[PDB]
Design a protein around this ligand. Structure first.
Ligand SMILES: [Mg+2]
Ligand SMILES: [Zn+2]
Length: 329
């Protein structure tokens, strides 16, 4: 009737679910490689989303396990642990004081569902690799946000498996709005969209308006979805902002995945993609470059939007950047 000793240690780790720096690798081990299922279940309960959207709990668990099973266990980075991490990171960003009572239950559901599906069935190679090899996926999506289109299509298609339709009790109006937001969020995870997303976030910080209660004013769809898009984008680019023990595990994983792509490119006589050549790699210099050109400008702009809620996240990012700089040989 009550939990095993393993289930109890897992539940104690899940008490950090509202904190930046959750031990997500430990949750992966303890859950029997079910980090996405257990973290999504915990967040759905915590935010009362089963009651709000009348999601049968058996349907939720069946869908979450099905979704987790369509992440590839042999992919070192773009797997269920990364999905779980982005979900939990989105969950913390949604709870930021500057956004209190800003977003509806449906918008919260969209951002979390989007986070959960955002990399499903990732083959561990880039859009460019799928385009250059003339893959079926690239043919299907006309070389345009190939992986991100595929993630969405799989995330939604899995709702049609036996007892998997977690949206069965939503009205058509709820479903159409949820779907448009989830699509808008996942398509924005394509790094080709980063510069336009960041420009729009900066424009929003420059024209920023606050309510009498001190929270952000977002009074049109365009502004609301832009913030959710940048939020899930920040969660996706949050590794360098985590405590260094977590950041370094993510770096080991992305470099294993990139080097594997580089090995496949070299064996096929293809040009080796940036940072994918294990014989010509500067892990440390690449991380400092990633932080300086991509991650820090994004998180600095996010920190301005929700000032001062993200100051400790930005501090961890700057400390991690200095640590990698100090190890450049
Ligand atoms: Mg992705
Ligand atoms: Zn991702």
């Amino acid at each position: 009737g009550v939990k095993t000793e393993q289930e109890d240690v897992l539940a104690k780790e899940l008490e950090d679910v509202n904190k930046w720096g959750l031990h997500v690798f430990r949750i992966a081990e303890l859950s029997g490689n079910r980090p996405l299922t257990v973290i999504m279940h915990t967040i759905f309960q915590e935010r009362d989303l089963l009651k709000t959207f009348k999601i049968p709990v058996d349907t939720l668990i069946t869908y979450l396990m099905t979704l987790e099973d369509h992440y590839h266990a042999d992919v070192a980075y773009h797997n269920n642990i990364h999905a779980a991490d982005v979900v939990q990171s989105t969950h913390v960003l949604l709870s930021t004081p500057a956004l209190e009572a800003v977003f509806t239950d449906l918008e919260i559901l969209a951002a979390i569902f989007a986070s959960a599906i955002h990399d499903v069935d990732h083959p561990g190679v880039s859009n460019q690799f799928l385009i250059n090899t003339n893959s079926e996926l690239a043919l299907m999506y006309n070389d345009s946000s190939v992986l991100e289109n595929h993630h969405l299509a799989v995330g939604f298609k899995l709702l049609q498996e036996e007892n998997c339709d977690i949206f069965q009790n939503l009205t058509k109006k709820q479903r159409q709005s949820l779907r448009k937001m989830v699509i808008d969020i996942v398509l924005a995870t394509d790094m080709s969209k980063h510069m336009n997303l960041l420009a729009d976030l900066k424009t929003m910080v420059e024209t920023k308006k606050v309510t009498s209660s001190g929270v952000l004013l977002l009074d049109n769809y365009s502004d609301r979805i832009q913030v959710l898009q940048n939020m899930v984008h920040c969660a996706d680019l949050s590794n360098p902002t985590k405590p260094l023990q977590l950041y370094r595990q993510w770096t080991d994983r992305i470099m294993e995945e990139f080097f594997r792509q580089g090995d496949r490119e070299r064996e096929r006589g293809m040009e080796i993609s940036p940072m994918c050549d294990k014989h010509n790699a500067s892990v440390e210099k690449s991380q400092v470059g990633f932080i300086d050109y991509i991650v820090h400008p994004l998180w600095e702009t996010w920190a301005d939007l929700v000032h001062p809620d993200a100051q400790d996240i930005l501090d961890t990012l700057e400390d991690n950047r200095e640590w990698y700089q100090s190890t450049i040989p």
